[PDB]
Amino acid sequence: GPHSLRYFVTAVSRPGLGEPRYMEVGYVDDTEFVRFDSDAENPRYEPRARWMEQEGPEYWERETQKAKGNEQSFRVDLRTLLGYYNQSKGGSHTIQVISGCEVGSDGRLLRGYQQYAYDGCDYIALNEDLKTWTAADMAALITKHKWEQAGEAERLRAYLEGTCVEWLRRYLKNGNATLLRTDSPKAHVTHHSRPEDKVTLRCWALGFYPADITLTWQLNGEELIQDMELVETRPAGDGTFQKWASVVVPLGKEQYYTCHVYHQGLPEPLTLRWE
């Protein structure tokens, strides 16, 4: 189906504790495959998927050089933003960037993005047209006009439509088998006490990958939307994910409820109940 190549960049100023920290993380689909961190010494662009080790010394050297080049640029950018916001040289500030392309099954661009934030808030973003900009405040407007005047959007459109898309093809080539991996959930229901004549049924899904999953509870064939409790899906720490969803039901009526688990990995959805 569709695919994406995205780079997540963070630059963080640290006045009096050292040089700004520059971090760059690349994702294919939603899987980290490269990373650069300016805080190692002899910082290097590094593979984060074994399948990227197919690339060879020239790739890695050129990406390292380019990342150190961005690091320098971002140092300047941070200083500029102090001016725009009349901010002192003593505080820590953050620039963040999300840059990338979504392509279809045919390999053609579906959408490109290049979004900036400052101190965690939208600053400037390239519009879907890949031609115009949305500035979030007055400071961003200064950047918008500088970027319009400099043809930055033309540059980005060319990168997004071509370069980015072509590199996505290449990486998919070496990672597609590993990327397609899927671990189905294993699920079970636990039983816990509530005050008076009520109990909690908790449906657990464990060991699954990728993270996208749905858990639902049904009374008799009919969904308990109004109020089931759940947790945000969370990493087990070993590459797989966890989720649960619970409902409070009458003591004695536990067998009136079923939990359903929906995941890509499953031949069909799981249906469970309390033992």
């Binding site: 780079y7 640029s73 500088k146 980005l156 980015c164 590199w167």
Partner: peptide, 9 residues
């Protein structure tokens, strides 16, 4: 391979 912005903020 990531884009390298050649103009400042």
């Amino acid at each position: 391979s990531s884009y390298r912005r050649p103009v400042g903020i």
